[PDB]
Amino acid sequence: KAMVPPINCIFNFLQQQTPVTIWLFEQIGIRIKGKIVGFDEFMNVVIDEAVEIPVNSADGKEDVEKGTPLGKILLKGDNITLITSA
Amino acid sequence: LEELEEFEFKHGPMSLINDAMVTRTPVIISLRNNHKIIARVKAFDRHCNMVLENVKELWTEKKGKNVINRERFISKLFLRGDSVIVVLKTP
Amino acid sequence: IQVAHSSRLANLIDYKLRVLTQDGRVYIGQLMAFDKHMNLVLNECIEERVPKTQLDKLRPLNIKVEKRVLGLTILRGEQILSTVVEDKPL
């Protein structure tokens, strides 16, 4: 029961290899699912098994069924709005 | 330390821009406002600020169902670097 | 009003300025202070904007600009495009 620094939470994503979903900065229409495997002081993140998930315009749900595989990507931290587990 | 940037400009990505400057060949610069600049780089810095000669600026307007290819000539120009998207070597 | 060609912002304290912002509005008021970020303090500031209904008149004239009286106002420097002198100090 303490302050958890955001960088240490990203490191917990890295260490426990927990899949994450990433909300992009101004692209409200797509998100990225994958596993974080490295980062830096700017929140640039290297993601393993990246898949680009379309987001329904009206419902707001994630269309996992037609997501696009990408592989290992370096998602530039200036493009990240939110990183969440599962 | 200036001897550091001397190396990053000889061996990092901006080496391409440096070769363009040294060999005086033109380059094609894509800008954030959808304009293309075909010009000779006279000077540059780490921001991709550039001083250019023989600038030829190309862009396309839209008037509904048709487009017009506009074009300009500038003898010499300063370009602020944050507008640069891609600098392409002319083959 | 005509001002000296060597004038910097440091000289324009107590002058009335029109300060133009990136969203299309203008702020008119006596400059009290400025900052390295170009943050500005305008005393007795008024904001003017051109409503979208009246914007068609500006295309290739009398424009009915909407005003808000703000008072003492801090403008954040990143929002500023440019500044113009309107009037000299008293």
């Binding site: 890295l14 101004e26 640039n44 290297v46 200036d78 | 990505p13 391409l16 998207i85 891609v86 | -």
Partner: protein, 74 residues
Amino acid sequence: PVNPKPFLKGLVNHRVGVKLKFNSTEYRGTLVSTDNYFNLQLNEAEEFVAGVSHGTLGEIFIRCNNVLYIRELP
């Protein structure tokens, strides 16, 4: 694990795809060199607009602020 700068330094002389923030434009080509700021230089690079190839470009430089992600290509 692999941090962003070592990962991108390991992609040198390999094919990468540089998706951009804007215009749905992705450049696919062999990564030549990289800056601390993640400016990029590609040889043999070629432009894709909305998944449609626009022909090869050659040797290009991409300024760091235009890049969305750099993906390794198989």
